[PDB]
Amino acid sequence: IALTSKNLRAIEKVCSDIMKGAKEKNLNVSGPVRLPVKTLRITTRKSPCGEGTNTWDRFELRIYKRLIDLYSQCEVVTQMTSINIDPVVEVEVIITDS
Amino acid sequence: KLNHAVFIVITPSAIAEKYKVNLSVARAVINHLADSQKLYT
Amino acid sequence: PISKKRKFINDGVFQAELNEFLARILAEDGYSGVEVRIRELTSLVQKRFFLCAMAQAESLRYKLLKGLAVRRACYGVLRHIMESGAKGCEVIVSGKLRAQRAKSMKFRDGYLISTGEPSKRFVNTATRSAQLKQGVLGIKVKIMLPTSILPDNISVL
Amino acid sequence: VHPKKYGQGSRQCRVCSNKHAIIRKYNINICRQCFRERADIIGFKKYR
Amino acid sequence: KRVQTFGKKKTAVAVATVTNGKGLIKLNGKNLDLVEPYILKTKVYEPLWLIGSGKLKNLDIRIRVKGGGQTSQIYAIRQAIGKGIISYYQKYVDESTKKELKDVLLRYDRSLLVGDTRRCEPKKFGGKGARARYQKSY
Amino acid sequence: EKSKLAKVEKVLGRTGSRGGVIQVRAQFMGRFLIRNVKGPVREGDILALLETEREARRL
Amino acid sequence: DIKLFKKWSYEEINIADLSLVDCIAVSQKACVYTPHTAGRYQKKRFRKALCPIVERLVNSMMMHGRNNGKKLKAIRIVAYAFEIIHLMTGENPLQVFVNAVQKGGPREDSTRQAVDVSPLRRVNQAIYLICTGARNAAFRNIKSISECLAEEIINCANESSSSYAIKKKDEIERVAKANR
Amino acid sequence: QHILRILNTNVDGKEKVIIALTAIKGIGKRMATVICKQANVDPTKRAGELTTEEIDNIVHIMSTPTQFKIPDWFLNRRKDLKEGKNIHVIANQLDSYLREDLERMKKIRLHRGLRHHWGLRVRGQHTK
Amino acid sequence: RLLEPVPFVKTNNCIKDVDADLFIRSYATHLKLHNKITYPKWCTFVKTGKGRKLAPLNEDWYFIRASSILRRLYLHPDIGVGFLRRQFSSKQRRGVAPNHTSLASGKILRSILQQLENLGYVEQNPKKKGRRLTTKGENAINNFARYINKKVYN
RNA sequence: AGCGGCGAGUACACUGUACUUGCUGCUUCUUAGAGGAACAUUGUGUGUCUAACACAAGGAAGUUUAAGGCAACAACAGGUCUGUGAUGUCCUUA
RNA sequence: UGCAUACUUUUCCUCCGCCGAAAGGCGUAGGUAAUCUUUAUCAAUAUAUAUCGUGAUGGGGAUAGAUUAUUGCAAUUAUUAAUCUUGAACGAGGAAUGCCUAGUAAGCAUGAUUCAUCAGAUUGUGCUGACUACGUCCCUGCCCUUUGUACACA
């Protein structure tokens, strides 16, 4: 079960939900995985005309990705996440045994 | 201009000025006497 | 089968459509929300895909477009902002204004922070434009939401 | 007609209706002239 | 038994594993003399003398090289080995000489034990140089 | 030619057309010699002069 | 307890002017096996002098044309130069450099009237003139840069005319004396 | 020993052979490096001992090298498109071939030939 | 000057414990004496790399590359055809255009790799697709490394 | 992704090593979630003894630790209707 | 060969084994991506030894000619390009000007953009870590105060 987004707190609270559910259900849940945050940078210049001191500004996209794993039924977790996720957060479910 | 040849301290710069020879033939003469820039033994 | 990197920019394109579509459709009232009238909206959206600063700014744009005097319309809308709760409001209108010389009038009242990233986070913006007989009018309404507490706001009880 | 899938005329801007100054970075295909103001509505902020 | 420490100055990195042995102080695969430049080899030799060859004879250091230029890598290696010897003296071998070793290391310089924050800044605007500008015409 | 010792204790001030000259006091004999210097001069430095009885202008 | 290039401990230092010694800051604190020490040099004022003189030479001799950044090449050239000096002059190369620095530095100058020169400025311009004499010696003169550096430094240590630093501090002294 | 006169200026007596044979022809040094390689002359020795037999070997290798192991790609004037084939033809006859192609160019009167007659390059030096 | 004092304890078990240049030249002489491979004559009229644009001018460059290819093969468990090209990438000044790095010719390195494959010093398997050196080559190079180490030691 | 441990070793050391293949005690080290540290801190000093700044020491951090982005009040008759189905007016439309 | 019709996805970087000096091609691993390119590693000035050893030389690479392949239904105004030949000035640049306060001057490279192909453009990053002040109004550009105006489109 890995979740990806752009903003910070929306995935922190969802991972807190993951941890509290793991503690409640006493599952064989592995520890949190802290993937590096990737940044994507594009360029664009102001001054729509050709004159003036050409100026260049940089915007950033801060992609996010965090992984966890659990040993339980997929239906209960795929209901529990949809209970307490936000529309701006996406998840993918992969199961483990030991 | 140059007028050095091969026909007639051990440092190449000193002996080249001593014998009025090019640096390459100076290195050759040094090797001949003993038997890029390096320190002494 | 698309990447997340291209998926999020496809989503950005979708929200680029959604912002302008919401701006066009939300004209008779405020911002009632979005869905993840209604029947037609959902049908069109599916077919193609497969305290309110914006509302107040649109109200003032309507009052200017109907031919009502800018001075009185702006004064009224500023009073409604003040009674809505924003500590102030920065409204500026530009265009021809009855003459051939470009001009603008700025109404100043209160704190009116105008720069800095905390200012941008706290303060929301609205800027609209519309046609006129011999030009185009531009209206800017800056509404600042009530302040977490501002770092400059200091008091000890 | 002679439409070709390559070159400058293969694609045009998706909004501004002018193909000049199209950015194809990250497969956006939106002209920069409109993209300057479309950056915020897409949600692509400027910080530094 | 064993200790694992780190050292980073500039972009170069270094991880040092210090363990008991017969003196197999090996930088990954290659030895510490075969790097080629003896100028950096002298600096590598510098921390060895201040501690003791007889002391180092009883311990093996596993040193890993990954990234950075020659000077940056040698500085990272020096930080890694300094932290390794300090931590090993604090942990396993002897505490009495640890204070003297760290005092003399501090006295000689500050760069031997902990590195520097000196790094490359993000590029500003005006010119190709990090603080240059285009030759404006007139 | 010759060089003779001098001592600087306190910085009186800086002058000059660009700010690069600092007024200082030397110590050979008297025990006070007005002089002007350029560059970094700190408290407690040892310097040298040209002649023992030539005086500058205080500004 | 430190030998320079594992050769010279330089335990003996001349009395000199008892100020250039402080400026060069030669001691076991600044004792170095090899050049190119990356300690902080632009922290405060005094760190300009806290740098070793051997480090200053290799930092300042490397400025001509495309030679910018060739600090390892500078280290090689100076290391060979010390070997050349130990051979063709019986005295210690460190003592040669020390004597050349103490006697080759200008003492007074002119910016307007004639003024004095800071002590850190004295050691700075001494290094500068030694390096720039090496530059003009190596500027298209058949003979090699290492020999140029060795000849210039020994000539400035022996106070002869063939050293550019020696013949240029004299010009500075005479021009400043003429001004005041 | 030094200063040996051949068809071209070959005063190269103190320098090395791999520059001596390039100075006279193939001053790009790669054609005359391969010529030296074919002739099998030691490069260690200098130009003060150029025997006549080595120059004879140079000319022998130069005379129609197509019968040797050298492929046509390395040889200049690979085709010079016509009914027949050719080879590198050394110095004066090399410039003779160049001017023969130049006069063929002129009588073919291409646009680039017109610019060449006017005194202009092909790509354009862009004085604009 | 080649040999330098070492304060730590050596092991002397492979070429990793010996300097690269001395070993590659010693093994170039070893292969020149043993006549294990050809020159080859076909590589003679082609320069080392496109960016080189000039003859290496040493008469043994092919043998030096032959001694270095397996040297890098021991260092890296898996390599590629472009690995040698990148390792021996050189400056290329396209006339007026500025310098850029460029890879050397791949046919010559492919051919010498085939030569050592015929010699048996290198083997290929579906698993670990990158080139690796066989077990017999391991002990051969180990013995040669210890064989040069003993003379260069004392 | 890193540090180890052992199942079998390739050769040497000696009473482990350069390199593989399979599993997992653990995560300063490959990475990062929040937070803290730094505030002329202290001491020797100047100052209308208030507001200030200097050296040294602890400290990675003593010019805000440093590059950045937000850029008002007001204007240019600066550029852009050749960027927009944003754009008025004069002009073209078989 | 040309049009019409159906099947995989050929429509990105590519590692491999070969063909071809190379360009480029062939059937393919991997990957919608810390997995595959590729990053226990992508460059260079350096490091060491060697041909040369300051003579516009073999430095220098402007120039055109002979061609092998790709990009593009179109490279002719020879795009891109592997090979050779061809061999201009250039002895460090006058009156003058621009940038420079510490991973910063300066030098060395590398990724991204527009791209069917093509950076010598702009931008992101890394390496080589320097010469120096640590202040001033004398130049210049701005600011305040005082003053004089017959200027106010100043």
mmCIF file of N, CA and C in Angstrom, chain E residues 3 5-6 9 17 20 22-23 32-33 43 46 54 58 78 88 92-93 97 103-104 124 128 132 138:
data_model
loop_
_atom_site.group_PDB
_atom_site.id
_atom_site.type_symbol
_atom_site.label_atom_id
_atom_site.label_comp_id
_atom_site.label_asym_id
_atom_site.label_seq_id
_atom_site.Cartn_x
_atom_site.Cartn_y
_atom_site.Cartn_z
ATOM 1 N N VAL E 3 32.246 -0.470 14.790
ATOM 2 C CA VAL E 3 31.587 0.830 14.779
ATOM 3 C C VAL E 3 31.454 1.283 13.332
ATOM 4 N N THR E 5 30.751 4.904 11.190
ATOM 5 C CA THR E 5 30.628 6.356 11.229
ATOM 6 C C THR E 5 30.626 6.946 9.825
ATOM 7 N N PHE E 6 30.447 8.262 9.729
ATOM 8 C CA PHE E 6 30.267 8.915 8.441
ATOM 9 C C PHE E 6 31.112 10.178 8.380
ATOM 10 N N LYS E 9 32.392 16.191 3.556
ATOM 11 C CA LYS E 9 32.654 17.572 3.181
ATOM 12 C C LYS E 9 32.522 17.685 1.672
ATOM 13 N N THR E 17 33.717 1.855 8.374
ATOM 14 C CA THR E 17 33.462 0.774 9.318
ATOM 15 C C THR E 17 34.784 0.386 9.966
ATOM 16 N N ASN E 20 37.890 -4.747 14.686
ATOM 17 C CA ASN E 20 39.128 -5.370 15.127
ATOM 18 C C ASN E 20 39.698 -6.265 14.032
ATOM 19 N N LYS E 22 43.878 -7.253 11.937
ATOM 20 C CA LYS E 22 45.329 -7.174 11.868
ATOM 21 C C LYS E 22 45.832 -5.943 11.127
ATOM 22 N N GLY E 23 44.958 -4.999 10.788
ATOM 23 C CA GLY E 23 45.393 -3.778 10.139
ATOM 24 C C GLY E 23 45.015 -3.692 8.676
ATOM 25 N N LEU E 32 45.404 2.668 0.179
ATOM 26 C CA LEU E 32 45.456 4.105 0.416
ATOM 27 C C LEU E 32 46.684 4.772 -0.192
ATOM 28 N N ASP E 33 47.619 3.999 -0.739
ATOM 29 C CA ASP E 33 48.817 4.542 -1.366
ATOM 30 C C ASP E 33 48.726 4.573 -2.885
ATOM 31 N N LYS E 43 48.078 14.039 3.063
ATOM 32 C CA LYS E 43 46.972 14.405 3.941
ATOM 33 C C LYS E 43 46.282 13.176 4.513
ATOM 34 N N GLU E 46 48.363 12.063 7.313
ATOM 35 C CA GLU E 46 48.392 12.983 8.451
ATOM 36 C C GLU E 46 47.649 12.462 9.678
ATOM 37 N N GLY E 54 51.084 1.579 15.838
ATOM 38 C CA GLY E 54 50.907 0.414 16.687
ATOM 39 C C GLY E 54 49.468 0.236 17.132
ATOM 40 N N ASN E 58 45.994 -3.029 15.375
ATOM 41 C CA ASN E 58 45.061 -3.964 15.989
ATOM 42 C C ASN E 58 43.634 -3.827 15.475
ATOM 43 N N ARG E 78 38.933 11.620 5.347
ATOM 44 C CA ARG E 78 39.540 12.087 6.589
ATOM 45 C C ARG E 78 38.499 12.279 7.683
ATOM 46 N N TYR E 88 35.460 4.810 18.153
ATOM 47 C CA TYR E 88 36.011 3.541 18.615
ATOM 48 C C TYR E 88 36.743 3.705 19.938
ATOM 49 N N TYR E 92 35.182 1.102 22.557
ATOM 50 C CA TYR E 92 35.762 -0.222 22.756
ATOM 51 C C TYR E 92 37.180 -0.217 23.309
ATOM 52 N N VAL E 93 38.121 0.454 22.644
ATOM 53 C CA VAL E 93 39.539 0.205 22.896
ATOM 54 C C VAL E 93 40.007 0.850 24.197
ATOM 55 N N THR E 97 43.064 7.591 26.451
ATOM 56 C CA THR E 97 43.760 8.238 25.347
ATOM 57 C C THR E 97 42.812 8.965 24.399
ATOM 58 N N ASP E 103 41.820 16.165 21.891
ATOM 59 C CA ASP E 103 42.388 17.472 22.199
ATOM 60 C C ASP E 103 43.453 17.862 21.183
ATOM 61 N N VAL E 104 44.353 16.934 20.847
ATOM 62 C CA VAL E 104 45.398 17.265 19.882
ATOM 63 C C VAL E 104 44.802 17.466 18.490
ATOM 64 N N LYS E 124 22.215 32.654 -9.321
ATOM 65 C CA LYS E 124 21.423 33.874 -9.389
ATOM 66 C C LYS E 124 21.272 34.283 -10.853
ATOM 67 N N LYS E 128 26.764 34.336 -16.718
ATOM 68 C CA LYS E 128 27.175 32.935 -16.667
ATOM 69 C C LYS E 128 27.912 32.619 -15.375
ATOM 70 N N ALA E 132 28.513 36.968 -11.900
ATOM 71 C CA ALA E 132 28.905 37.753 -13.060
ATOM 72 C C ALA E 132 27.661 38.270 -13.769
ATOM 73 N N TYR E 138 26.249 49.563 -25.297
ATOM 74 C CA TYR E 138 25.871 50.966 -25.181
ATOM 75 C C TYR E 138 25.721 51.607 -26.557
#
